[PDB]
Amino acid sequence: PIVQNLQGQMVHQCISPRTLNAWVKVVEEKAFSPEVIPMFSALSCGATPQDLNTMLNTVGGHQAAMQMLKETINEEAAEWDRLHPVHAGPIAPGQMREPRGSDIAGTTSTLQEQIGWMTHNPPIPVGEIYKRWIILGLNKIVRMYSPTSILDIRQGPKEPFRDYVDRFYKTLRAEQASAATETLLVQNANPDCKTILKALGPGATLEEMMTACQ
Amino acid sequence: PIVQNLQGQMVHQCISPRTLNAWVKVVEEKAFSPEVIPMFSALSCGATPQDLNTMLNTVGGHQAAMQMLKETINEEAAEWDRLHPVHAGPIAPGQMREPRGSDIAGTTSTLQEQIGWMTHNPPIPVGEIYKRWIILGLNKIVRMYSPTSILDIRQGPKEPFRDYVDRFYKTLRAEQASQEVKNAATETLLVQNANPDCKTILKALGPGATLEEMMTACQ
Amino acid sequence: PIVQNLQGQMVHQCISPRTLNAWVKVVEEKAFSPEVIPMFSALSCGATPQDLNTMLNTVGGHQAAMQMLKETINEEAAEWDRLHPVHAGPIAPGQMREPRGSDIAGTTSTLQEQIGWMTHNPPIPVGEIYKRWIILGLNKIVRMYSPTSILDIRQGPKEPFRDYVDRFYKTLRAEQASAATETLLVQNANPDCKTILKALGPGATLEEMMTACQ
Amino acid sequence: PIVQNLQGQMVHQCISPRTLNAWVKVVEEKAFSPEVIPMFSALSCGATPQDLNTMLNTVGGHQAAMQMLKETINEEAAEWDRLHPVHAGPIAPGQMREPRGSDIAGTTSTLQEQIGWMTHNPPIPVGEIYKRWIILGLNKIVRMYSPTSILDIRQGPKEPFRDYVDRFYKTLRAEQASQEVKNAATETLLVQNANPDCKTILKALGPGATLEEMMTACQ
Amino acid sequence: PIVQNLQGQMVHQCISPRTLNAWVKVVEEKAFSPEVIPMFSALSCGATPQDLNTMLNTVGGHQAAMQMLKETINEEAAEWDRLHPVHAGPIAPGQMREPRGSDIAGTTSTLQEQIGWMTHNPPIPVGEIYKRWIILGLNKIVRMYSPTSILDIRQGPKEPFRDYVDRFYKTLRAEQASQEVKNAATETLLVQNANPDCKTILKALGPGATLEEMMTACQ
Amino acid sequence: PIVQNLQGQMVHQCISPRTLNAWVKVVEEKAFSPEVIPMFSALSCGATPQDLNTMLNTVGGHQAAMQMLKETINEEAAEWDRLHPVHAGPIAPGQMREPRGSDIAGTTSTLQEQIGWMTHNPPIPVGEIYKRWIILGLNKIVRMYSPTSILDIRQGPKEPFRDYVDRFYKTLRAEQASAATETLLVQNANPDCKTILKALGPGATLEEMMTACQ
């Protein structure tokens, strides 16, 4: 990653073994549960495109997801190239070239070039641009890996309301990855709780609803 | 988080994997037992709003509690906006804007804006303001997750007094109430709901006895 | 805590996750065995009152003990207020106020005020004062949690002398938490060892005693 | 490894126990699954040739693979010597010599010589050159350890499409081939070797469908 | 402990949780096997007397050994006071006092006094002096905890020579004796107490054979 | 160890608990498998003779090996003393003395003297000299602990060639610790693989051999 040293300057630092392992293990433990995306984003704080590729290349399995991710990255990179076409020809000696999409993804750029862009004045934040594309792709994967539509999360006749609400927002977390939808919560409650929730009224907070269905 | 460097400057530092994992694991292990709140507050020392959202977003499960937390944050943010309204209309290009409640919550503000506020002179401590809101929400969650009411904690006939007092204060710790209200609950209930053998001993010590004296006398 | 940076100045630092976890785990593993007190004192090196309250608030269970601790703190704080009463009235603009007992305990003081006291020239070491009160209370808890009086640690007829001595000083550790008492060691030995210890003489070292009863 | 200090200088630092253990454990856990290569490259960030040899020498078992690695290194070192021959004959006493391939591999060079090359102005990045050789050797090993050929990955009649695509790209990941060759293999095989029900759905999407569209359609 | 900072000054640093835990765990795992002593000495690198007491006080159990340690410390402290008596009578207010044995042991000295002595110019290394006393006490404890005497280590009839030599030097390592005495024990016992088949082979090598030659010959 | 601080100067640092534990655990897990030697050498980066003695004194068991190591060290130290005899007599006040072999081994030198030698201009690298002697001794131990001669690693009739090659080079690793020997690999292969390897020809790489015997 690129971070600040004790002195105040922006310098490259190796990715730490702790970071590497934490990322591999969260995917081993949780696959593409929604909380894997904020974990990715935090563990890639300050990352270069090289570091982002390292993180993704160390995922064990899930290679269909990783190919979908590559396809998303290539779509965003094409849009980048359409918005920011690069000068064709040899670049001036010693000077910074403009990054294309495959440079942002770390495929056609060197680490030194990535550092140059990310620390230039003004900077071209190629790590953050690439991370945005990766997170867009990972949100698609989350939604796809979600096993159940929110329309089908419905409270069982013996199911505690809190357990139902947990299932509902766990599912909505994934489904929304990539408003009124939350009104399904009352619609999909069981008859005893729905009767209580309807008499409660429509301005009730979730806390009020959960207390009333205790 | 924001930390001091050797030049004396306050600067951004990435949240550590150790911190991230520690928070996820405390919720895995303890759910919303009362000690989760002080652990959250300490693990979020120096946190930006971004970092606070990262910590909450990484909680596994408990999504009903997380939605309740979001509703508490929105309530506090609305009160912030009532107390500290931001003057409407475009502002001078290139200058620092004033944060509204959704800025403090990290929803409508960038990291750079959060750093700018937190290191301004004088600082606008948006991380600490948001943390206060989150802690208010967690207090509500701990009360809701508590499986026992303090009125139902009564000493068993074969129950050691220390075990009863442990249950009593475990339950009271999770209630949401001022210390004045909590300590009044103790004056009203603790001796009253001891078992007959212990209660006769405790009444003889008088209303001035310390807990140490009560526990030693019932050992 | 407040510690020295690489440069030589006293600054506030966040409590580390490692410290937080170590403290919670020693209480989970050992409850109020005597060695928990020196572990507390070392893990709270440099602590502010805020940090000390953090450490205590993260203890799982043992809430009767924690209430006893609060009562001890309030007694010491009252004694503080009796010895160091604070000026009544508004304090001069920009100047340091005097801490009362509830300020030392972190209840009515801010972190910034705690830092100010602890780094002032001369300092008011409110972290160390509060830690003394906490350790006084924890020593009371240790003694109370001790299951057996030292008078009742008596060597069994088949019990190796070393195992007995281990039980004796384990118990004395807790009982003394808050001289001649150690002469109980010979008094409470079994007949075969007592016969050997008495013939050894009264100046014997523990090593000499243990060797002789091997 | 070589790292920057506060005076801005590049200086040697000892390899950490955490790094050493992380590498030994990834080989223990994953053997030569493809992700071992990116993990090796990241854990050897800033490595000298000495450090690279330390990492390889600490691998437990897999000594046939390690001997194959040494043979690849010797092949690359010979090509280095053909492209960049070192002028024969004694050189000026006290001056920096030019590295030959066995110097880059850490066999005939001292640590001090490696530091000298890596921090020279301009640098001779012998750690990065050796690492490239090692990665070429590991690519060969991963292909050899792969238990399946991409031609034998065919969807089972009861196999979820996502599980089949996972197997397909797990296998393709281990093959040693340009991305052009690998993606041609996909165009030639992935739909062709789907099971009848999935294949009829995929053919109807057309050759332009994305993998997301294919996987969603076969769910 | 006392450590160097960037300004070149020796300054106090808090004992780390990692150090604390490492020491408690080595005693949990190994009790007073001989390697506990070098581990104690290394983990107490730079320690003040306060830190040394912290380490000892955190040992779980083994309180007979801990009391023996205190008695050894008091013996050494008394010898310190005989060799380096502190002039009696009040001293100049505000100046550094001289440490007596109980000051070195951390009992009658403050942390500030310990820092003052250890960083004085010239230093009075009270941490190192106390550590020497503790190590003398631990040497006694290791000898006492050893379950075997070197006279009772004799090779079994089916016992590999290497296993016998391992037992022999494990036992000798725990004895409390100069290296001269220990190596004389080896010359007197090791070959003598080998089993008949090994003993005939070892006698033929002669009294000049190395242990490597003895072990290779009896393999 | 002696290492560089953030500022660029060579200073003594305590051995870390992590290093201490890693070394003890690799010997617990692997005894004297060949990879223990490169692990030792890396974990002792920058070590003083004191630190090297610490590392060896913390090995659990294997005390016959450790005595063999001491005997190797004493042989190398005697050779040192023969090559670099020290001045007999009192050394000049305030000046550096010359190390003898037992000084290099940490037996008759203080830590301060070790630091002085290792940081002098020019330096006497007593840590590295001692480490060389230790590694010479550890290589002897590896070879001795190896259970099987390379002459006796022979492929079974049903044994996969890769598994045989693994056994062969695992054994050669240890045997060589302290060229044509690798031609035993074809000699010691089973009849089916030997037939294939001989028809392959004599210039084949190991990769070619392993592929052909798949």
Ligand SMILES: C[C@@H]1CN(c2ccc3c(=O)n(-c4ccc(Cl)c5c(NS(C)(=O)=O)nn(C)c45)c([C@H](Cc4cc(F)cc(F)c4)NC(=O)Cn4nc(C(F)F)c5c4C(F)(F)[C@@H]4C[C@H]54)nc3c2)C[C@H](C)O1
């Ligand atoms: C000498 C150094 C070079 N070091 C480099 C250098 C550059 C790149 C580098 O640039 N990228 C890189 C980034 C972004 C794009 Cl879009 C491309 C790209 N686009 S393309 C021409 O259309 O295929 N090609 N590459 C190479 C891209 C990649 C990507 C990263 C990735 C992106 C993703 F989204 C999902 C991920 F898991 C990983 N890794 C792969 O691709 C690996 N892989 N291989 C196959 C094929 F066998 F089936 C498959 C993958 C897979 F992605 F895992 C997925 C299952 C399918 N690694 C690299 C590694 C590695 C080191 C060990 O030594």
Ligand SMILES: C[C@@H]1CN(c2ccc3c(=O)n(-c4ccc(Cl)c5c(NS(C)(=O)=O)nn(C)c45)c([C@H](Cc4cc(F)cc(F)c4)NC(=O)Cn4nc(C(F)F)c5c4C(F)(F)[C@@H]4C[C@H]54)nc3c2)C[C@H](C)O1
């Ligand atoms: C590109 C970056 C951007 N990165 C950002 C940026 C900004 C915000 C960011 O600002 N916030 C944020 C903070 C505070 C407020 Cl009040 C709001 C808000 N108020 S609102 C319009 O009324 O819905 N909206 N958001 C987005 C808010 C949040 C909150 C945080 C949270 C607050 C809480 F209290 C409890 C928590 F566990 C987590 N996370 C969510 O909301 C996720 N979530 N989704 C649903 C729904 F799908 F089912 C549910 C949650 C849930 F909260 F967990 C709860 C179960 C219900 N994350 C963010 C992430 C993520 C990263 C991977 O990539």
Ligand SMILES: C[C@@H]1CN(c2ccc3c(=O)n(-c4ccc(Cl)c5c(NS(C)(=O)=O)nn(C)c45)c([C@H](Cc4cc(F)cc(F)c4)NC(=O)Cn4nc(C(F)F)c5c4C(F)(F)[C@@H]4C[C@H]54)nc3c2)C[C@H](C)O1
């Ligand atoms: C916004 C911030 C504010 N952050 C603060 C700020 C201030 C204080 C802060 O000042 N203190 C604090 C310090 C010292 C004193 Cl004496 C008092 C005090 N004296 S009093 C008016 O007589 O009750 N009141 N308080 C609040 C005191 C405390 C004490 C500490 C403690 C002292 C003890 F000795 C034993 C401990 F385990 C913990 N924690 C509690 O009290 C918690 N608690 N609650 C009950 C009640 F439900 F049953 C019980 C406890 C219990 F102690 F555990 C025990 C079982 C009984 N935490 C605080 C937390 C928390 C953070 C998450 O967000």
Ligand SMILES: C[C@@H]1CN(c2ccc3c(=O)n(-c4ccc(Cl)c5c(NS(C)(=O)=O)nn(C)c45)c([C@H](Cc4cc(F)cc(F)c4)NC(=O)Cn4nc(C(F)F)c5c4C(F)(F)[C@@H]4C[C@H]54)nc3c2)C[C@H](C)O1
């Ligand atoms: C005093 C110090 C010196 N410290 C040094 C110094 C220099 C080198 C050093 O330079 N290299 C080094 C690097 C690159 C090349 Cl190509 C050569 C080379 N080419 S060659 C003349 O053709 O054999 N020889 N060496 C020594 C090379 C090596 C290589 C590294 C390696 C490369 C690889 F690719 C795969 C690996 F796992 C490890 N380690 C080995 O070789 C060990 N080994 N031994 C045998 C044989 F016994 F059975 C086998 C191995 C094996 F490789 F594991 C494989 C199973 C076969 N270690 C070194 C160690 C060790 C320390 C403890 O103390």
Ligand SMILES: C[C@@H]1CN(c2ccc3c(=O)n(-c4ccc(Cl)c5c(NS(C)(=O)=O)nn(C)c45)c([C@H](Cc4cc(F)cc(F)c4)NC(=O)Cn4nc(C(F)F)c5c4C(F)(F)[C@@H]4C[C@H]54)nc3c2)C[C@H](C)O1
């Ligand atoms: C306010 C702070 C003050 N903090 C201090 C301050 C000072 C000292 C401090 O100075 N020392 C200290 C150092 C050296 C000497 Cl020789 C003495 C001494 N000599 S004496 C007058 O003859 O008894 N007295 N003390 C207090 C000494 C000790 C010693 C250390 C020790 C030395 C040993 F060798 C073996 C050890 F395991 C530990 N710890 C004990 O003694 C505890 N203990 N108690 C008993 C008895 F109850 F059963 C027993 C022990 C025992 F030692 F474990 C052993 C089983 C017998 N701790 C201290 C703690 C503790 C913190 C939580 O809060």
Ligand SMILES: C[C@@H]1CN(c2ccc3c(=O)n(-c4ccc(Cl)c5c(NS(C)(=O)=O)nn(C)c45)c([C@H](Cc4cc(F)cc(F)c4)NC(=O)Cn4nc(C(F)F)c5c4C(F)(F)[C@@H]4C[C@H]54)nc3c2)C[C@H](C)O1
């Ligand atoms: C006050 C400080 C002093 N601190 C010191 C200071 C100095 C030295 C110090 O100098 N060395 C030291 C270094 C090198 C040499 Cl060659 C000698 C030496 N040569 S000799 C006169 O011929 O015996 N004597 N010593 C003391 C030497 C040693 C060696 C190291 C070692 C070298 C080896 F190769 C293999 C190892 F495992 C360890 N440790 C031992 O010897 C321990 N030991 N004891 C016996 C005996 F009981 F059976 C046996 C060992 C054994 F080695 F393990 C092996 C099983 C046989 N430790 C020391 C510790 C320890 C601390 C806790 O407190």
